[PDB]
Design a protein around this ligand. Structure first.
Ligand SMILES: CCCCCCCCCCCCCCCCCCCC(=O)O[C@H](COC(=O)CCCCCCCCCCCCCC)COP(=O)(O)OCCN
Ligand SMILES: CCCCCCCCCCCCCCCCCCCC(=O)O[C@H](COC(=O)CCCCCCCCCCCCCC)COP(=O)(O)OCCN
Ligand SMILES: CCCCCCCCCCCCCCCCCCCC(=O)O[C@H](COC(=O)CCCCCCCCCCCCCC)COP(=O)(O)OCCN
Ligand SMILES: CCCCCCCCCCCCCCCCCCCC(=O)O[C@H](COC(=O)CCCCCCCCCCCCCC)COP(=O)(O)OCCN
Ligand SMILES: CCCCCCCCCCCCCCCCCCCC(=O)O[C@H](COC(=O)CCCCCCCCCCCCCC)COP(=O)(O)OCCN
Ligand SMILES: CCCCCCCCCCCCCCCCCCCC(=O)O[C@H](COC(=O)CCCCCCCCCCCCCC)COP(=O)(O)OCCN
Ligand SMILES: CCCCCCCCCCCCCCCCCCCC(=O)O[C@H](COC(=O)CCCCCCCCCCCCCC)COP(=O)(O)OCCN
Ligand SMILES: CCCCCCCCCCCCCCCCCCCC(=O)O[C@H](COC(=O)CCCCCCCCCCCCCC)COP(=O)(O)OCCN
Ligand SMILES: CCCCCCCCCCCCCCCCCCCC(=O)O[C@H](COC(=O)CCCCCCCCCCCCCC)COP(=O)(O)OCCN
Ligand SMILES: CCCCCCCCCCCCCCCCCCCC(=O)O[C@H](COC(=O)CCCCCCCCCCCCCC)COP(=O)(O)OCCN
Ligand SMILES: CCCCCCCCCCCCCCCCCCCC(=O)O[C@H](COC(=O)CCCCCCCCCCCCCC)COP(=O)(O)OCCN
Ligand SMILES: CCCCCCCCCCCCCCCCCCCC(=O)O[C@H](COC(=O)CCCCCCCCCCCCCC)COP(=O)(O)OCCN
Lengths: 788, 489
């Protein structure tokens, strides 16, 4: 099938990495990692001819066929867009990591094993058609990213970031699994392409599946409030930061939302939840991105804001499914906008991280307050950073023009179905204001100003060309989809829209004549002009409203709440186990006895306990009455005895009178064994008495506590009333007519207790012999072995 | 021939007896116990193929018929549990070769080992309640002595505690057998199952079923009957503890399973809602205790409690998908808890301390152990390429199909919290800089742990091989008519 050896090729090469790493000491190991994504990328260029003329690629590898689980693979426009993104930026990040990391100072085989596991896992996430296989690849993505963030394990902040990112994304993944299972019960099947052709709104498990899947997808792509882990995942290596937190992992929830949109966007809860939380995290991260003083936190909040933009456009594209007024069909534009900016974001964001990585090891710092004039020192990376920042701001000559004009066009035409939605675009509008600010500030506090010849490191800051190769390729692709937007749209972006909006295109010419549309006087043009002018008049006065902005950024955050929530959770659990686990055996016996009494008395009281039949009962006789009075006397004198010898001899009297009951209830063997065993056991109690320590002994009475007496009376009366209810109900008789009929005719015996013990049921006498053997050997072992 | 069913019982028994004669000859103790345990594994595999090929295997001990003598029954679930017990016993025995000192194994250690595996293997295959009682005391007596052997102050104290609890629960099982004999009149499983189903509309059967819940939950730690287990399992040495955590609490779970899939089927609503609430309390207690401690043994102890709660919640639904999921989770959890106690023992051997806060930086000196513990932690949590995924997947699916949303979310969050506990061990112990320990070459004992880890990984990969055994086990659990027409011929 040739794609089975494409999905599982990074895992096999991840097996083969440390072999080549410790057996080839001369050549850098990353070169050996380099061709495989290249190969996958070239292989993923081979499918565009089949996907433009609406044909899909299906493959199947069964894993548990009786539980109906396979590794399915389905290839259409959306999965090809993501796969081309993954493999192309993967090869570029591999090249940049070859030129970035060192040889004799870094563990490199670990780096490329983790990275190639992550690449294979992400390619598995995208291409998957089975839900459990998708969840498996999802989990492998989370674990490999957890490994990549903590690449320097000898430093604390990397471990904090890895722990927090692990906990958040695992929480989302587990609730994602629950939503997948609920959806697979709602439909008949597990494969995604058969859930589309079946109705699912007439089912009780539709809304919990919606909320749980949506919860996990918002957790992965760093939405609100779950954006918290992504600014602390910036202690990774810079290729990890670029690849993972630009192009692959933070878009997995985006892929799941866009993949399941033809199922769940028929309801309003999906589309409005997605759209509103996207707008909220867009504005919140756009506000917060201007407070930071280092480059990577600014780019992390930038990533969160553009992901919120993409998912809000996905929500409006979900609104496309209900109805379009008289063939207007405007909401579909939103889908295209999302997908465009999706592709767009990946490219320039990757380049920007590479830029800051370069300047890090060309200056030694990455804070904004020490590095100054670097235009005439570092011209090429200044050109790349300027292209990426102007494309991120949303300006005419670069990519961000089309992204922002389609965003404002999609948002202004979406307020015409509800009045309160008139609130929605202008909020988004001020988000763009906020956007421009940090992006402007980025360049204007990275390369402008003046050079500091005292704190910086090198007299010559000329970067090598091999580091500069991959940002140049990304910036060139930025400029190419800037000036030429038509060919990549018609080749890639159109079947992505036909995938996300499946079963909806009765005509297909309106989408094509909107793709071919580029110019024409729009009211969103002066909106972008106002964005530009207001960001210009907002940036120049930024040292004036700086303290107000710092204190209002201090006024509301979400890592405070998470840190105190975990402190609360661990302290509450620790105080719980310090409360209920005291260590005293008396208390645990009280809990066990009270639970026994409560469960049995509630079980009796819940029923009605009919049919008390006293006809089974035997006639009472005087000897048993007198002997019962005797053992009640011995019981009372063993609970109220002041000394312990009195309780020992009363327990002995209880034993000998139980033997006299055995005589009186016609049981000779029981009487013989009972007499001998009670004499031996009373001798053992007297052994245990006379070696009590003479200090702290004092020979004190049994202390009276009221709860012990209440629990004891409840235990005794409970088992008494269960014995009376059980003995005097309905019954089948017994099976001892066989034993009195076949002790002599079939076995060789006249005694019947002994023939039961050795012939009819002799299989359990062997193991009571074993119990006695273990007891004697254990007593010998305890007395003799004294290693201390 | 037909005595193959006794070969999991007879082979260790004989072995234990012939280990009594030569205490001071430790080499021949090791050789005979090793050869007999390997023969036990081979005989249990042959029994599992025997019960797979033709039907359920029943053997009357004498030549006496089915109500009137002792009958031993091996279905597919009991054969799977015997094979799992055999594998755990072999790994713990080789760890015992490397771990237990000389003085403790001159004094009858391997005999007590073999008597414990006699007790558990006899408990998984029996067809009588009172014979099951006798096998519980074989198991418990050997566990008392293995807990106390060596005689330091800690294991004296918690042997007193553990012995006290099990004496009380043994007396309670005696009085439960007495009540049920007064109601029914028989003592084997199949015929009293038929008699209970002939008078199933009586409240006293519900009361005695609740009493069996209390007894078997004292055996395998349920809330609110769990309180003996943290100190009792904090006491013993490491291979003894791996035996205890792998085997002792999971025969109470099997006894609950056999009891409510065979005996008590009428008036099922009350008993199953009781099992559901006790299981939810067990899961919550386990995850609270796993979060609370910075001590490795306590973390694995509360993970035992949490996994027992998940299995009991799987039992509490009478659907074949939930029964299938709890069988898968049962097998992998036995293997996994034995594995994790052996890991904790190796780490304690290296660090000379059990406090997580005391040491860091073990990847820089012990990489194979570190990545083995990483894979063991992720397999404990339930990550899908590893072992414990399909069990909790089928449990969650069967709870969603019966409209229990909140309980399925409790299962998933419990999986999260047990992952957090074991990864807390991994991230604070293995990562970081080097401060806590001194370089000491480990030897030998790492390999049974690696054998258990390789078998758990192969278990997670090969569900399609190990599934039709579990399918026949489910087909006999949700239909006891085949069980009672196999025995009562
Ligand atoms: C149904 C399943 C579906 C998919 C589910 C997920 C599957 C994931 C599959 C991928 C798993 C990736 C595992 C990667 C780790 C493999 C480890 C191999 C052993 C290894 O590293 O050996 C090293 C290489 O040398 C040698 O081995 C000897 C070389 C000479 C011959 C020894 O070297 P080293 O590691 O000690 O050295 C490091 C210096 N820092
Ligand atoms: C590195 C640049 C590789 C360019 C991709 C190959 C050539 C190319 O333009 O391919 C087009 C798709 O590109 C793409 O889909 C480019 C994807 C780039 C992903 C990120 C790296 C399809 O060919 P075509 O439509 O341009 O021409 C033929 C009919 N017109
Ligand atoms: C916190 C982690 C869990 C967060 C997600 C909870 C998802 C709940 C989805 C809604 C749901 O199941 O609602 C109904 C039952 O409630 C429930 O099942 C509520 C479950 C609450 C679990 C909280 C765990 C902590 C089912 O009814 P329906 O959804 O069909 O009714 C239409 C209601 N709009
Ligand atoms: C957490 C973030 C999501 C919060 C909303 C989740 C629940 C959605 C409930 C359903 C819903 O959106 O109802 C719409 C009202 O929107 C609403 O009520 C959405 C919230 C509006 C107030 C906040 C605006 C910012 C119905 O109304 P419709 O507008 O869809 O009716 C179109 C008829 N042709
Ligand atoms: C060690 C103790 C072993 C058991 C000793 C029991 C003694 C029983 C005495 C006995 O048989 O009493 C007879 C029946 O009692 C009755 O008829 C009295 C019934 C009520 C018994 C209440 C006991 C307190 C009356 O006595 P008897 O046959 O000697 O009298 C006629 C000769 N004068
Ligand atoms: C009645 C039983 C019928 C069957 C016959 C059985 C005969 C054997 C019974 C068990 C024998 C065990 C012998 C152990 C050694 C005893 C002598 C040494 C210990 C001793 O003198 O202890 C004192 C005795 O208790 C006292 O001074 C108070 C003793 C109270 C005994 C209560 C028995 C109630 C029975 C009720 C009727 C049952 C009828 C059954 C047919 C405690 O006193 P200390 O502290 O001052 O020690 C004096 C310090 N130099
Ligand atoms: C149905 C009716 C209700 C149920 C039956 C109730 C029976 C009550 C019987 C009397 C109970 C006595 C309680 C004694 C409390 C403890 C006590 O004082 O113990 C020791 C004296 O024992 C004693 O004084 C106890 C002696 C034994 C009790 C009397 C037995 C008479 C049996 C008559 C019937 C026989 C029938 C035969 C089958 C002294 O304690 P310490 O530590 O200070 O020791 C100092 C020695 N140096
Ligand atoms: C009437 C029913 C009870 C009959 C026996 C009562 C008297 C003996 C009890 C123990 C006395 C106190 C004690 O511990 O004395 C120690 C010796 O005890 C020992 O050596 C303990 C073992 C005693 C065995 C007595 C067997 C009695 C008959 C058993 C039933 C019939 C035979 C059935 C097989 C001396 O103390 P220490 O300071 O010297 O330290 C021990 C090292 N020397
Ligand atoms: C099963 C495997 C049995 C044979 C291998 C184990 C025994 C190895 C030789 C040990 C030996 O000679 O032990 C003698 C008795 O042996 C025995 O009793 C061992 C044979 C056990 C046969 C069991 C059936 C009767 C007593 O050893 P010693 O006089 O040298 O001791 C002096 C210090 N303990
Ligand atoms: C085609 C389908 C294939 C299906 C396969 C299904 C089964 C998959 C099971 C995977 C089991 C993996 C077991 C862990 C690897 C053990 C490695 C032992 C040797 C070791 O530690 O090597 C390190 C390098 O390897 C490493 O660093 C690599 C190990 C770390 C990554 C583990 C990722 C696990 C992901 C989750 C499970 C999948 C050395 O490192 P050093 O720098 O200390 O060198 C010190 C110089 N000797
Ligand atoms: C099941 C788990 C098996 C795991 C793989 C095997 C682990 C051991 C591999 C060889 C390491 C070196 C062994 C040296 C040796 O003679 O060890 C003996 C134990 O036998 C052994 O370690 C061999 C045990 C073989 C068990 C599996 C047999 C299957 C058929 C005695 O131990 P010692 O004197 O070296 O150590 C005591 C230090 N205090
Ligand atoms: C110095 C050395 C250091 C070594 C360190 C190693 C650390 C771990 C590293 C990773 C180990 C990977 C092990 C891979 C095992 C592959 C699977 C075993 C082959 C096999 O027969 O598997 C299945 C049955 O296995 C089973 O059923 C067996 C498992 C069950 C055991 C029972 C107890 C649990 C059948 O699978 P299949 O082919 O039928 O299915 C697939 C599609 N049909």
């Amino acid at each position: 099938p040739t794609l089975h050896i494409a999905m599982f090729a990074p895992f096999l090469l991840a097996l083969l990495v440390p072999f080549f790493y410790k057996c080839i000491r001369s050549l850098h190991v990353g070169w050996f990692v380099f061709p495989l994504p290249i190969a996958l990328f070239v292989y993923f260029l081979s499918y565009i001819d089949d996907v433009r003329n609406d044909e899909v690629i299906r493959a199947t590898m069964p894993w548990i066929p009786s539980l109906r689980i396979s590794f399915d693979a389905y290839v259409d426009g959306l999965s090809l867009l993501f796969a081309l993104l993954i493999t192309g930026i993967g090869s570029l990040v591999v090249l940049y990591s070859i030129y970035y990391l060192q040889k004799g100072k870094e563990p490199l085989g670990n780096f490329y094993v983790y990275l190639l596991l992550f690449m294979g896992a992400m390619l598995g996430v995208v291409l998957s058609d089975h839900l459990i296989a998708l969840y498996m690849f999802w989990e492998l993505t989370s674990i490999s990213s957890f490994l990549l963030i903590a690449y320097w394990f000898k430093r604390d902040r990397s471990r904090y970031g890895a722990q927090k990112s692990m906990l958040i994304t695992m929480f989302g993944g587990l609730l994602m699994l629950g939503g997948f299972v609920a959806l697979a019960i709602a439909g008949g099947t597990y494969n995604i392409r058969e859930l589309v052709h079946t109705p699912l709104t007439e089912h009780p498990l539709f809304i919990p599946a919606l909320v749980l899947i949506l919860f996990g997808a918002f957790t992965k792509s760093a939405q609100f409030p779950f954006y918290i882990w992504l600014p602390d995942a910036m202690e990774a290596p810079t290729p990890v930061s670029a690849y993972l937190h630009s192009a692959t992992m933070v878009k997995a929830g985006i892929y799941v939302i866009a993949r399941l949109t033809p199922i769940f966007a028929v309801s309003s809860v999906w589309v409005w939840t997605v759209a509103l939380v996207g707008l909220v995290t867009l504005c919140w991260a756009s506000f917060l991105a201007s407070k930071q003083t280092d480059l990577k936190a600014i780019l992390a909040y930038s990533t969160v804001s553009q992901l919120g933009l993409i998912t809000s456009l996905l929500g409006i594209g979900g609104l496309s499914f209900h109805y379009d007024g008289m063939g207007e069909n405007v909401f579909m534009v939103a889908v295209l906008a999302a997908i465009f900016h999706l592709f767009n974001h990946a490219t320039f964001k990757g380049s920007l991280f590479m830029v800051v990585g370069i300047v890090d090891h060309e200056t030694g710092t990455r804070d904004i307050r020490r590095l100054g004039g670097l235009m005439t020192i570092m011209p090429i990376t200044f050109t790349i950073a300027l292209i990426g920042s102007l494309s991120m701001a949303g300006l005419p000559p670069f990519n961000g023009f089309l992204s922002k004009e389609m965003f404002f066009t999609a948002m202004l035409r979406a307020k015409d179905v509800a009045g309160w939605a008139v609130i929605l675009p202008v909020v988004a509008w001020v988000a763009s204001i906020f956007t421009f600010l940090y992006s402007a500030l980025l360049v204007s506090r990275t390369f402008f100003g003046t050079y500091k010849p005292h704190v910086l490191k090198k007299e010559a800051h000329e970067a090598p060309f091999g580091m500069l190769i991959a940002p140049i390729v990304l910036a060139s692709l930025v400029v190419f989809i800037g000036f030429v937007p038509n060919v990549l749209s018609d080749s890639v972006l159109a079947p992505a829209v036909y995938a996300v909006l499946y079963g909806l295109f009765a005509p297909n010419e309106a989408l094509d004549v909107h793709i071919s549309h580029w110019h024409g006087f729009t009211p969103e043009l002066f909106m972008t002009i106002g964005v530009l002018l207001f960001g210009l008049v907002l940036y120049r006065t930024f040292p004036k409203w700086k303290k107000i902005y710092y204190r209002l950024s201090e006024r509301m955050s979400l890592n405070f709440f998470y840190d105190q929530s975990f402190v609360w959770m661990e302290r509450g659990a620790r105080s719980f186990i310090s409360r209920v686990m005291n260590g005293s055996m008396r208390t645990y016996l009280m809990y066990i006895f009270t639970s026994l009494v409560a469960l049995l008395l509630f079980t009796i009281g819940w029923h009605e306990q009919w049919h008390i039949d006293l006809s089974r009962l035997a006639h009472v006789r005087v000897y048993e009455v007198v002997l019962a009075i005797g053992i009640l006397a011995a019981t009372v004198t063993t609970v109220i005895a002041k000394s312990r010898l009195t309780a020992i001899v009363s327990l002995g009297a209880v034993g000998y009178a139980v033997a006299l009951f055995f005589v009186l209830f016609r049981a000779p063997d029981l009487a013989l064994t009972q007499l001998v065993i009670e004499t031996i056991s009373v001798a053992l109690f007297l052994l245990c008495f006379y070696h009590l320590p003479k200090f702290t002994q004092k020979q004190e009475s049994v202390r009276f506590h009221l709860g012990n007496a209440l629990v004891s009376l409840a235990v005794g009366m409970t088992m008494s009333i269960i014995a009376f209810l059980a003995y005097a109900g309905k019954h089948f008789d017994s099976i001892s007519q066989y034993y009195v009929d076949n002790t002599y005719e079939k076995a060789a015996g006249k005694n019947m207790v002994n023939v039961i013990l050795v012939d009819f049921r002799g299989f359990d006498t062997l193991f009571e012999i074993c119990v006695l053997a273990i007891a004697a050997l254990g007593i010998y072992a305890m007395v003799k072995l004294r290693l201390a | 021939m037909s005595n193959l069913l006794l070969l999991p019982i007879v082979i260790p028994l004989v072995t234990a007896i012939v280990l009594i004669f030569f205490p001071k000859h430790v080499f021949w103790q090791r050789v005979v116990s090793l050869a007999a345990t390997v023969g036990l594994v081979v005989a249990s595999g042959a029994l599992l193929h025997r019960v797979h090929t033709d039907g359920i295997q029943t053997l009357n001990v004498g030549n006496w018929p089915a109500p009137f003598g002792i009958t031993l029954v091996s279905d597919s679930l009991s054969a799977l549990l015997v094979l799992t017990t055999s594998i755990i016993a072999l790994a713990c025995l080789v760890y015992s070769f490397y771990a237990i000192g000389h003085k403790r194994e001159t004094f009858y250690y391997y005999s007590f080992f073999q008597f414990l595996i006699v007790g558990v293997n006899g408990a998984f295959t029996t067809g009588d309640l009172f014979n099951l009682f006798v096998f519980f005391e074989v198991m418990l007596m050997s566990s008392y002595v293995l807990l106390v052997l060596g005689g330091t102050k800690i294991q004296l104290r918690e042997t007193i505690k553990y012995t006290l609890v099990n004496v009380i629960s043994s007396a309670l099982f005696v009085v439960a057998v007495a009540y049920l004999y007064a109601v029914t009149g028989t003592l084997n499983m199949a015929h009293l199952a038929d008699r209970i189903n002939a008078l199933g509309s009586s409240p006293i059967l519900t009361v005695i079923a609740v009493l069996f819940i209390i007894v078997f939950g004292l055996k395998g730690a349920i809330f609110p009957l769990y309180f003996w287990l943290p100190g009792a399992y904090y006491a013993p040495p490491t291979p003894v503890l791996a035996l205890f955590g792998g085997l002792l609490t999971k025969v109470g779970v099997y006894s609950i399973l056999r009891t409510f899939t065979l005996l008590f089927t009428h008036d099922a609503a009350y008993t199953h809602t009781l099992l559901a609430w006790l299981a939810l309390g067990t899961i919550i207690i386990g995850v609270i205790g796993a979060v609370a401690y910075n001590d490795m043994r306590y973390i694995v102890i509360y993970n035992i409690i949490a996994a027992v709660g998940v299995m009991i919640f799987g039992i509490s639904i009478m659907t074949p998908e939930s029964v299938e999921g709890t069988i898968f989770y049962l097998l992998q959890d036995m293997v996994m808890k034995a594995m994790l106690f052996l890991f904790v023992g190796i780490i304690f051997s290296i660090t000379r301390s059990n406090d997580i806060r005391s040491f860091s930086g073990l990847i820089t000196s012990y990489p194979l152990l570190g990545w083995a513990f990483f894979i063991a932690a992720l397999s404990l949590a339930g990550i899908p390429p590893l072992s414990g995924f399909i069990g909790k997947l089928l449990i969650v699916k069967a709870s969603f199909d019966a409209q229990l949303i909140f309980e399925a979310i409790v299962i998933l969050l419990s999986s999260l919290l047990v992952l957090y506990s074991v990864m807390k061990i991994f991230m604070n112990g293995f990562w970081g800089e080097k401060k806590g320990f001194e370089q000491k070459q480990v030897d030998g004992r790492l390999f049974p742990v690696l054998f258990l880890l390789v078998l758990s990984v192969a278990y997670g990969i090969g569900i399609e091989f190990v599934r039709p055994f579990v399918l026949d086990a489910v087909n006999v659990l949700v239909d006891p008519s085949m069980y009672i027409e196999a025995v009562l011929k």
